[model samples]
Target: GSSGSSGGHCVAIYHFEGSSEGTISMAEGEDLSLMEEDKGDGWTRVRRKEGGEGYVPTSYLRVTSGPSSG
Candidate 1:
């Protein structure tokens, strides 16, 4: 269980199954973040600038820059 910072990204957040999923966290209210990686698989990782880790729900997270997380 990990939490990302305000609006940071650039890391890969692996899932419990050791697989990648393009998921994005909430974008408003409370702590918000986005996927950190652009892996060609499908799922993206959520990350923070402070080195935070963990995988958030595929519904509350978001992937905004770089390449498509899909």
Candidate 2:
């Protein structure tokens, strides 16, 4: 998945599905095209504790990436 400061928007390649979900970007050059999002959707990837991954909507999801002050 990819995220940009612009528009506070994020992009991700779909992965596995389950009670937990999340997004994983294609390894660097690799790409996982995404399906069209809802007109007014705030979708998100549900980064699970397990290896599984999938996507949900930001409207419903709360957890998010927290980049440390490197």
Candidate 3:
């Protein structure tokens, strides 16, 4: 029940879980598509590379920098 910005931002899944609170479950090595704006509590909206989309803890994601194979 959350959303991210354009051009999927790369983030490594440090930790995450799907809950009624609106977070979604992502697989190992899942990259999170981060929102432009922070959720005000270390949370960010993201889209799963495989499919589903939702909000997740920012601490659970590690930003990846450098030219991607995008």
Which prediction has the highest TM-score against the true structure?
Answer: 3
Put down candidate 1 lDDT per residue, 1-70, tens digits, no spaces.
3432435543222323324453233234333245454455444455444555455544433333444433
Predicted candidate 2 versus true structure: per-residue lDDT over 1-70, tens digit per residue: 4543322223232332334334432222222223334356575443323343355544433222345513
Q: In angstroms, give how far residue 2 of model 1 lies from its true place.
A: 28
Task: State in Å the error of residue 36, model 3.
Answer: 4.9
What alpha-carbon RMSD in Å does predicted model 2 have with respect to the real structure?
10.1
TM-score preference between candidates 1 and 3, better one: 3
Work out the TM-score per prediction: 0.30, 0.30, 0.63
Q: What lDDT is obtained when candidate 1 is compared to the true structure? A: 0.41
Q: What is the C-alpha lDDT profile of model 3 across 34-70, one tens digit per residue?
A: 6544656876777766777786767777666545344
Error of 3 at 5 (Å): 9.9
Clashes of 2: 5
What overall lDDT goes with each candidate model? Answer: 0.41, 0.36, 0.65
- Candidate 3, residue 19: lDDT: 74
